[PDB]
Amino acid sequence: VKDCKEADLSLYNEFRLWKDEPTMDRTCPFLDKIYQEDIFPCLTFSKSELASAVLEAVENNTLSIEPVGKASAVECGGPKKCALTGQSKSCKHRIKLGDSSNYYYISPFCRYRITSVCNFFTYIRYIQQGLVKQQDVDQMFWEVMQLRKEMSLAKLGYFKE
Amino acid sequence: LMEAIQKQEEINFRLQDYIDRIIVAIMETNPSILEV
Amino acid sequence: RDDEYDYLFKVVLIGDSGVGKSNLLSRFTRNEFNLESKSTIGVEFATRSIQVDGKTIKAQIWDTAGLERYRAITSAYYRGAVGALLVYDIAKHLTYENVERWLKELRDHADSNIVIMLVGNKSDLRHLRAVPTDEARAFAEKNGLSFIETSALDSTNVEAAFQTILTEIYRIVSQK
Numbered sequence A: 001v002k003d004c005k006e007a008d009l010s011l012y013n014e015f016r017l018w019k020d021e022p023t024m025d026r027t028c029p030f031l032d033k034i035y036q037e038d039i040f041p042c043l044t045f046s047k048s049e050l051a052s053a054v055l056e057a058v059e060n061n062t063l064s065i066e067p068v069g070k071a072s073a074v075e076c077g078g079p080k081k082c083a084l085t086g087q088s089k090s091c092k093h094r095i096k097l098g099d100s101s102n103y104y105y106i107s108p109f110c111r112y113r114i115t116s117v118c119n120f121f122t123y124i125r126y127i128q129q130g131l132v133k134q135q136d137v138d139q140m141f142w143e144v145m146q147l148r149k150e151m152s153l154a155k156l157g158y159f160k161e
Numbered sequence B: 001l002m003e004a005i006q007k008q009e010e011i012n013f014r015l016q017d018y019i020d021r022i023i024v025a026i027m028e029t030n031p032s033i034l035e036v
Numbered sequence C: 001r002d003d004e005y006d007y008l009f010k011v012v013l014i015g016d017s018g019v020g021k022s023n024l025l026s027r028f029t030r031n032e033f034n035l036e037s038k039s040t041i042g043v044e045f046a047t048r049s050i051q052v053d054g055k056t057i058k059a060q061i062w063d064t065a066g067l068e069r070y071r072a073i074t075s076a077y078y079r080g081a082v083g084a085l086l087v088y089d090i091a092k093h094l095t096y097e098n099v100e101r102w103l104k105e106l107r108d109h110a111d112s113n114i115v116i117m118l119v120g121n122k123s124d125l126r127h128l129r130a131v132p133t134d135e136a137r138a139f140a141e142k143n144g145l146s147f148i149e150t151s152a153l154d155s156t157n158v159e160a161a162f163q164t165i166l167t168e169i170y171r172i173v174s175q176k
Ligand SMILES: Nc1nc2c(ncn2[C@@H]2O[C@H](COP(=O)(O)OP(=O)(O)NP(=O)(O)O)[C@@H](O)[C@H]2O)c(=O)[nH]1
Pocket: C015, C016, C017, C018, C019, C020, C021, C022, C023, C024, C034, C035, C036, C037, C038, C039, C040, C064, C065, C066, C067, C121, C122, C123, C124, C125, C150, C151, C152, C153, C154
C-alpha cells in the first residue's frame, strides 16, 4: 500500500477564502468546522468545569505548559494524578491558565491533546497577523491539514510522548 | 541523480571556504563593510 | 548631524542554530521580525545607540551562523567583544543543554571580563516550553551570568535584554 495525499476541494476552497480575509471569530465557516470537528472533542475531559476554562485560555493564548525538573490536590491534582482526566498516571507537565489561578498537573495524553490545539491556534494567529510571507497557499493549506490531522488523532486517543 | 549532490556539495564547500577567507580579510582591515 | 557616542561596545550573538539570534538582532536594531528567516551566511553587525547614566552607548551587535565547529573565523568574531548574548530556545531543551558548550568557546576564544548574558528566547511559545525559567536563572546565577527571557516575535524583553548587558558593560569599563 502507498501513502498519498489529495486536498479535499471543498476544504481547500473554504481555507483559501478565509486566508484572503482572515478572522479569529469562532463563528466563521473555516473555524466553526474545526471547532466542532477537532477542537471541542480534543478539549473534552473528565473534569468538565476546568476543561471549559482551558478552552478559553487557549483561545486567549494565556495557557502555558511547563515540565517539572502550599496548594492542595482536589483542584490542582498532583504528580501521580492528572487534573483534567481523573486518571492516575505519572504527570511530567503542569498547566497554567493565568495570571495563574493554580498550577494544574497533566497526563502526557492530555498534554498531547492540548498542545495539538495550541499549535493550530498558533499557526492560525501567525496568518491572521501574517507574518506568513514566503509560503504559498497550497503549502499553508497542507499545514492546516497537518495541524488538523494531529488533532484528529489526539481526539481519538492516539498521541505521542 | 546521486552524483549531482556529491559534486554539488564540493561546490558548496568551495564557495563557503571562499566566504570564510574573504570575511576574515574584511575584518582584518575594514569591518565597516559587514554593517547592515 | 550628531552621530556622536561616548562608548562603543561590541556585543556578539552566540548559541545553537535556530534559537533566534538573527531576529533578536533585527528586533533590537530595526524593530523587525521574520518568521521565515533563513540561516545566516557570512558575518554581520548592526548598530544602535542608547543612553546609560547620561552617557551615550553605541552598541555594535554582531551576528553569524549558529552552526560552529570548524569555522576558524571565530577568532575574529570574538575579538574585541566585551559582551555576549548567549541564546537558547525555551522550547528546545537541547539548545539549553548546549549552553555549556557555548560557555566553553567563550572561556576559550573570547576575552575574560566579557559580560555574558543568558537569554531564553521564544518565550511566546507558552505550550511548548522545555526549560523552566528557574532552572535557567539558577544556572545563570551560579555561573556568573545575567539571565532574561525574550521573545523576538512579540518583542517581550528584547529591548530590556540589551539595555541590561550594555549597562553592566558600562559599569565595568567606567570603573577600571
Ligand atoms: N515563536 C518564535 N519564533 C522565533 C523567535 N525568534 C526566532 N524565531 C524563529 O526561529 C527560526 C530561527 O530564527 P533565526 O533568527 O534565524 O535563528 P538564528 O539563531 O539566527 N539561526 P542561525 O544561527 O542559523 O543564523 C525562524 O523561523 C524564526 O522566525 C521568537 O521569539 N519566537
